[PDB]
Design an enzyme around this catalytic site. Structure first.
Site, PDB file in Angstrom:
ATOM      1  N   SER B  46       0.785  -1.223   0.000  1.00 52.20           N
ATOM      2  CA  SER B  46       0.000   0.000   0.000  1.00 52.20           C
ATOM      3  C   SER B  46       0.820   1.278   0.000  1.00 52.20           C
ATOM      4  O   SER B  46       0.257   2.345  -0.277  1.00 52.20           O
ATOM      5  CB  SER B  46      -1.037   0.005   1.130  1.00 52.20           C
ATOM      6  OG  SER B  46      -0.745  -0.943   2.132  1.00 52.20           O
ATOM      7  N   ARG B 226       4.527  -0.931  13.215  1.00 52.89           N
ATOM      8  CA  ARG B 226       4.907  -0.138  12.057  1.00 52.89           C
ATOM      9  C   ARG B 226       4.909   1.358  12.349  1.00 52.89           C
ATOM     10  O   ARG B 226       5.675   2.096  11.719  1.00 52.89           O
ATOM     11  CB  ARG B 226       3.987  -0.467  10.868  1.00 52.89           C
ATOM     12  CG  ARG B 226       2.723   0.362  10.807  1.00 52.89           C
ATOM     13  CD  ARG B 226       1.417  -0.316  10.503  1.00 52.89           C
ATOM     14  NE  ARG B 226       1.072  -0.543   9.132  1.00 52.89           N
ATOM     15  CZ  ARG B 226      -0.106  -0.535   8.530  1.00 52.89           C
ATOM     16  NH1 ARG B 226      -1.258  -0.269   9.131  1.00 52.89           N
ATOM     17  NH2 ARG B 226      -0.102  -0.800   7.231  1.00 52.89           N
TER      18      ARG B 226
END
Ligand code: AUC
Ligand code: AUC
Ligand code: AUC
Ligand code: AUC
Lengths: 243, 242
Positions: B46, B226
């Site tokens: 993404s 993340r």
């Protein structure tokens, strides 16, 4: 434009004399608490950083979006202005001295020209090139602020699309995946009791696939009341479902 | 690029394998916890929405910043109308598959060459090469690409670079602005992990910091690392907080 009588509830509690203009999708569909005051014109104060920034970029006074406005180490009126600032930073902290110098370098002739192009209020920049928006003759209404900001939103101002996009990103004040606020405050001072100053909050909200343009101003003679320029509009917009 | 191995404790504490690349001012002043992993190339997943959106705009596939992507799905996500910013920031698989198809392989290849985007390998299917195909990009290359975007130096109109940049704004304060993008290929196994990314830049006062994070993910619960690993490192470096 329609009058929404219930929106004065927010004004009456604080004894605020002011106006909120809220438009869904475009400036053809607007509502307000006060029809008379909606087109009354007031000093723009730091809301004039919007046009001034665009003009600075258009004329080449401001080089690009990453120009740093360096502090010379000399006293400024606010401690928060005593530092190097980006274009966004200078707008967001309302650093007057940065934009006074931009205005000087733009100059009266070019300033007049662009305000005519932008249909910006009464277009009267007398009162001094570095103070006309705060102490001078320049006046603009809530309705006109909405029209101007809509034009900016659609990139329809007479300025490059690049420069309009630059100033738009400089105005982001709230960000979420499906919710984005562009806004700018203004405050002319407390004036007197008889001749009060003006406080502003103008901008637009993107919620999902809808856009709402807004402009608020109020008389202010006490600096303690300043946060109402955001809290009144926010309460109104939250009551309408604008997150 | 210098190695800062003192950052490894932030990865080991959560039992994850990954890399963080952080650059002050430009990509000539970068530091990373792991020089080897910093240049290894992973599925962009993404994070490919950045180049895909730019290419969409450049080719005319996306009309402009105010285009609405209308729903005509096993995700509730993909049954909503979205702006370009909304589509970039939420799950919008149908939108980006369709953008890629309309762009097509020749134009897609050309722009990824111009952008110096990873291994530039778009094999694997025109609407899936960034997610299950052959496309790979390193953390270092993400920083270079993002720096180019920041400076408007990509081979694309400044207008379109600015449009995509405002769509990447994720945090805003008067003297603090974050442009960022998550990535995630899916949960894998220990043997065959997925990848998760967080890339972007932080403007703090008059400084800019470019960053790129990736990690192997083999546990759904570890996805939020993340952002939290990068955030902790940026805290330690004095970027987050005063
Ligand atoms: N431009 C500018 Au102003 C204030 N106050
Ligand atoms: N474009 C793009 Au994507 C995912 N994952
Ligand atoms: N959002 C998004 Au996608 C794919 N592939
Ligand atoms: N040019 C080009 Au190609 C692919 N696949």
């Amino acid at each position: 434009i329609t009058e929404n009588t219930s929106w004065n509830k927010e004004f009456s509690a604080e004894a605020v004399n002011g106006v909120f203009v809220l438009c869904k999708s475009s400036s053809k569909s607007c509502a307000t608490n006060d029809l008379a005051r909606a087109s009354k014109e007031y000093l723009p104060a730091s809301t004039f950083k919007i046009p001034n920034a665009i003009i600075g970029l258009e004329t080449g006074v401001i080089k690009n979006e990453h120009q740093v406005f360096k502090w010379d180490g000399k006293p400024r009126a606010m401690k928060q202005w005593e530092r190097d600032l980006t274009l966004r930073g200078a707008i967001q902290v309302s650093a007057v001295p940065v934009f006074q110098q931009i205005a000087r370098e733009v100059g009266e002739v070019r300033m007049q020209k662009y305000l005519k192009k932008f249909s910006y209020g009464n277009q009267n920049i007398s009162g001094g090139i570095d103070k006309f928006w705060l102490e001078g003759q320049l006046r603009i209404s809530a309705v006109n602020q909405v029209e101007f900001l809509e034009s900016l939103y659609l990139n329809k101002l007479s300025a490059s699309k690049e420069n309009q996009l630059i100033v738009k990103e400089a105005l982001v004040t709230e960000a979420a995946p499906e919710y984005l606020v562009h806004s700018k405050t203004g405050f002319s001072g407390v004036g007197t009791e008889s001749n009060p100053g003006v406080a502003w909050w103008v901008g637009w909200v993107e919620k999902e696939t809808e856009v709402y343009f807004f402009a608020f101003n109020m008389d202010i003679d006490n600096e303690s009341k300043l946060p109402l320029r955001k809290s009144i509009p926010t309460k109104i917009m939250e009551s309408e479902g604008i997150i």
